[PDB]
Curated annotation (Swiss-Prot):
Cytoplasm as UniProt keyword: yes
Family membership noted in the UniProt record: Belongs to the cyclophilin-type PPIase family. PPIase A subfamily.
Name the record gives this protein: Peptidyl-prolyl cis-trans isomerase A
The entry's keywords: Acetylation, Apoptosis, Cytoplasm, Glycoprotein, Host-virus interaction, Isomerase, Isopeptide bond, Nucleus, Phosphoprotein, Rotamase, Secreted, Ubl conjugation
Gene label: PPIA
Domain of life: Eukaryota
Length: 164
């Protein structure tokens, strides 16, 4: 089966609740493996204790910068950066999990959770999963964001792992 991973989300260290994701290993196995390993922390680094640095209500929650905590950072399990695997999967609606980047072939650890259909990103950002449970937790998170993306409180991944 495709893997399932979870984040436990906290607001300034208070439990908010659990989000679980399906990873589309069947269509983007390299990109799915990256996010799975960073979620388990089996390699000794990954998402745990990292923040959603950029949240824009009605757009997306951006996270996964566990090096520099501000959108300049993050690293893949394959080195700093890796290639765009394909653009088969599209930004079809709320719950879509897609890679943030800084142009072609600059995939790291940074990702976003769509709270809308973001079709203008189709072909620019590799889609690799979707929210399975806790879309209400993502909707709560999205209320701590602003038009520029600054969060009014610290939104953290207190825990994460694989359920598969």
């Amino acid at each position: 089966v495709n893997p399932t991973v979870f984040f436990d989300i906290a607001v300034d260290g208070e439990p908010l609740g659990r989000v679980s994701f399906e990873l589309f290993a069947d269509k983007v196995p390299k990109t799915a493996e990256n996010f799975r390993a960073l979620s388990t922390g089996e390699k000794g680094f990954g998402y745990k204790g990292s923040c959603f640095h950029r949240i824009i209500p009605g757009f997306m929650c951006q996270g996964g910068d566990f090096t520099r905590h501000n959108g300049t950072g993050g690293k893949s399990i394959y080195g700093e950066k890796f290639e765009d695997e394909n653009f088969i999967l599209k930004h079809t609606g709320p719950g879509i999990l897609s890679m943030a980047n800084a142009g072609p072939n600059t995939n790291g650890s940074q990702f976003f959770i769509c709270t809308a259909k973001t079709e203008w990103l189709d072909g620019c950002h590799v889609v690799f999963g979707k929210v399975k449970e806790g879309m209400n937790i993502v909707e709560a998170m999205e209320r701590f964001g602003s038009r520029n993306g600054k969060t009014s409180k610290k939104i953290t991944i207190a825990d994460c792992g694989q359920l598969e």
